[PDB]
């Protein structure tokens, strides 16, 4: 089928799920706790084993009261509502979701290959064909998400999981939002923020295209285009209107990056009349077979060493904390639809 045929069926499938969301599809007692894979103000991610199947999953655990304090109620309801409705080869799948008196749970597929982040930092940088292979997956993923009126808002190597075939899967929809107009929330990660977000303007899906420019630059250089010790210093560099490229960057790469890391919204690739085709048809992607990437037929440039479905060697060690469940229901109204 054509891109349009695929996207039309994709919207019909998404809308049915968006309008009648899946809710309470599992319970905590159906999982065995293995190890904490990640922890921060946004919550924890726990490796769990589902007893009925023996499958491993990454369980995102959110403390309802902490979500309220962080003013993330609407963002959390967005994340779960969007995740249960989407279906794309390069998105981490939401397998189950449920809540109890104290916490919200999102059970996701577990990719022991880990985040692109760890591999990128250790290796140092990815050669242009290697960075291109990942970038092609993100372009197709944003074409899919944006067609559903979804803005992602947190692209970075930390949110890109590497599967057993070396393909990537976008995870963490904490700031994803279904919006047809412009939006104003100050959110994302400092290095990846478009100038319009820093400048407190109303913004749209073009921020995701800017973030793609940052990602490609970081993948190919080994460091982001705008970095400093503190976020305030990063913002100054982003708004200054200046970017420097490593001497090893190809002429085509630099040209694509000037078009993505473009302050002028009437000129930024992805935003314009021709949309995503301005990116797909760029000289840097001349060797890219978009259909073969989608069909997962392209040989991956890197396959993480496979050490078992429950292996955690690609994740750091975190302090193991209890999963406390109060005897009293917390935040009943705020999360009734979760």
């Amino acid at each position: 089928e054509s891109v349009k045929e695929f996207l039309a069926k994709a919207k019909e499938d998404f809308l049915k799920k968006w309008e009648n969301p899946a809710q309470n599809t599992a319970h905590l007692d159906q999982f065995e706790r293995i190890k904490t894979l990640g922890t921060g103000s946004y919550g924890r991610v726990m490796l769990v084993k589902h007893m009925e199947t023996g499958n491993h999953y990454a369980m995102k655990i959110l403390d309802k009261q902490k979500v309220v304090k962080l003013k993330q109620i609407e963002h959390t309801l967005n994340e779960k509502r969007i995740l249960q409705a989407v279906n794309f080869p390069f998105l981490v799948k939401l397998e189950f979701s449920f809540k109890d008196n104290s916490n919200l749970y999102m059970v996701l597929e577990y990719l022991p290959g880990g985040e692109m982040f760890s591999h990128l930092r250790r290796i140092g940088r990815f050669s242009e064909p290697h960075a291109r292979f990942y970038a092609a997956q993100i372009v197709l993923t944003f074409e899919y998400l944006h067609s559903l009126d979804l803005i992602y808002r947190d692209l970075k190597p930390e949110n890109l999981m590497i599967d057993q075939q070396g393909y990537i899967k976008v995870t963490d929809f904490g700031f994803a939002k279904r919006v047809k107009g412009r939006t104003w929330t100050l959110c994302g990660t400092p290095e990846y923020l478009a100038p319009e977000i820093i400048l407190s303007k109303g913004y749209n899906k073009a921020v995701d295209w800017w973030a793609l420019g940052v990602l490609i630059y970081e993948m190919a250089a080994g460091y982001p285009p705008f970095f400093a010790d503190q976020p305030i210093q990063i913002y100054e560099k982003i708004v200054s209107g200046k970017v420097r490229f490593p001497s090893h960057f190809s002429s085509d790469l630099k040209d694509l990056l000037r078009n993505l890391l473009q302050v002028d919204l009437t000129k930024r690739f992805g935003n314009l009349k021709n949309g995503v085709n301005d990116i797909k048809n760029h000289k840097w992607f001349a060797t890219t077979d978009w259909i073969a990437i989608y069909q997962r037929k392209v040989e991956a440039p890197f396959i993480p060493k496979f050490k078992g479905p429950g292996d955690t060697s690609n994740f750091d060690d975190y302090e193991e904390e209890e999963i406390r469940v109060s005897i009293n229901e917390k935040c009943g109204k705020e999360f009734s639809e979760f």
Binding site: Y42, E158, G174, C187, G188, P224, F227, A228, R244
Partner: peptide, 18 residues
């Protein structure tokens, strides 16, 4: 080098959302 400057910086680990 830009690489040496990045490596000596405090933002080489996983980055938190704002």
């Amino acid at each position: 080098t830009t690489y040496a400057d990045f490596i000596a910086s405090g933002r080489t680990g996983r980055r938190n959302a704002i």
